Ligand binder design. Structure first.
Ligand SMILES: NC(=O)c1ccc[n+]([C@@H]2O[C@H](COP(=O)([O-])OP(=O)(O)OC[C@H]3O[C@@H](n4cnc5c(N)ncnc54)[C@H](OP(=O)(O)O)[C@@H]3O)[C@@H](O)[C@H]2O)c1
Ligand SMILES: CC(=C\c1ccccc1)/C=C1/SC(=S)N(CC(=O)O)C1=O
Ligand SMILES: [Cl-]
Ligand SMILES: [Cl-]
Length: 274
């Protein structure tokens, strides 16, 4: 498991997180596979996936309840648990209520990282960030960040926040280059913000031409095209990745990707696919 520093915190986190979207349902709760999902989370954690990415929205809250059971087999302080507040809850009272309920479902006293899940232009960012700072001051949150914020909105959040914005969680993979084109990655790299890439395998939806290039590189490394997609992200300063892995084979495979060393020419070829 590769580690990288979170923001400028002097703290290192696993550079692969465990994405939990789908676990225990999608937009609504799914109870039908609870024991199997808890077992999957424990296995991921024991394998070294101690960075866990979830949200109050996941499974209508049930994802957090499944995570809450799974973590009971481990030392809370060994885990880096990330949760997120949905855009309808960014006013002060709703945000603190959401946080508290997230802590009840996770059955834990704090989250390591709390994110604005999506921006809501109707709710002033200063109100939202002050509410989050109240959570930090009460010991409910160790660090705060944002998600789905473009560069300009990240700059605005940094200007309105009493607490450091340690990360921005955005879609980034071998075909989705919005963070590059926006200056967001470069901004993060120069300002001590960790860019957390979600859908880093693009949910396995690639084109034929990307495929041809990934296949040559994977062959040379004895790897799958998905391992190369992850190695590519992880080779970039300030980039951490949150793949969803719902099976043990994928959890093992994705962990091995943290050992791939791409050459400079490989990086250049891969950069050029977008
Ligand atoms: N901030 C946000 O708004 C936001 C938005 C979307 C997602 N996220 C977070 O980021 C996570 C990742 O996003 P994502 O699930 O959309 O995309 P992803 O991780 O790129 O795609 C997951 C898909 O790839 C498969 N997979 C994983 N490892 C694989 C491997 N080695 N080979 C082949 N397939 C593999 C999974 O299959 P199996 O499950 O069958 O292994 C699953 O179908 C989410 O769980 C969530 O925590 C955040
Ligand atoms: C677009 C499909 C959705 S909706 C939803 S919530 N998520 C996860 C997230 O936003 O964290 C998706 O990937
Ligand atoms: Cl939305
Ligand atoms: Cl994974």
């Amino acid at each position: 498991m590769l580690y990288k520093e979170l923001g400028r915190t002097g703290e290192e986190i696993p550079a692969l997180g465990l994405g939990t979207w789908g676990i225990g349902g999608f937009e609504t709760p799914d109870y039908s596979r609870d024991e199997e999902m808890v077992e999957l989370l424990k296995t991921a954690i024991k394998m070294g996936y101690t960075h866990i990415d979830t949200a109050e929205y996941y499974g209508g809250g049930h994802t957090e309840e499944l995570i809450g059971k799974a973590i009971k087999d481990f030392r809370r302080e060994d885990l880096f648990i990330v949760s997120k507040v949905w855009p309808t809850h960014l006013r002060r009272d709703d945000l603190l209520r959401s946080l508290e309920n997230t802590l009840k479902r996770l059955d834990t006293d704090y989250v390591d990282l709390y994110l604005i899940h999506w921006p809501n232009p109707e709710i002033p960012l200063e109100e939202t960030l002050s509410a989050m700072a109240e959570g930090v001051r009460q010991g409910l949150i160790r660090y705060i960040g944002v998600s789905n914020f473009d560069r300009r909105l990240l700059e605005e959040a940094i200007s309105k926040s009493q607490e450091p914005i340690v990360c921005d969680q955005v879609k980034y993979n071998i075909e989705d280059r919005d963070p590059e084109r926006d200056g967001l990655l470069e901004f993060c790299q120069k300002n001590g913000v960790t860019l957390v890439a979600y859908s880093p395998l693009r949910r396995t939806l690639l084109s034929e031409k990307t495929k041809r290039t990934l296949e040559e590189i994977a062959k040379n490394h004895g790897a799958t095209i998905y391992q190369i997609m992850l190695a590519w992200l992880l080779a970039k300063p300030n980039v951490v990745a949150i793949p969803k892995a719902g099976r043990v084979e994928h959890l093992r495979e994705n962990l091995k990707a943290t050992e791939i060393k791409l050459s400079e020419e490989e990086m250049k070829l891969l950069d050029s696919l977008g």
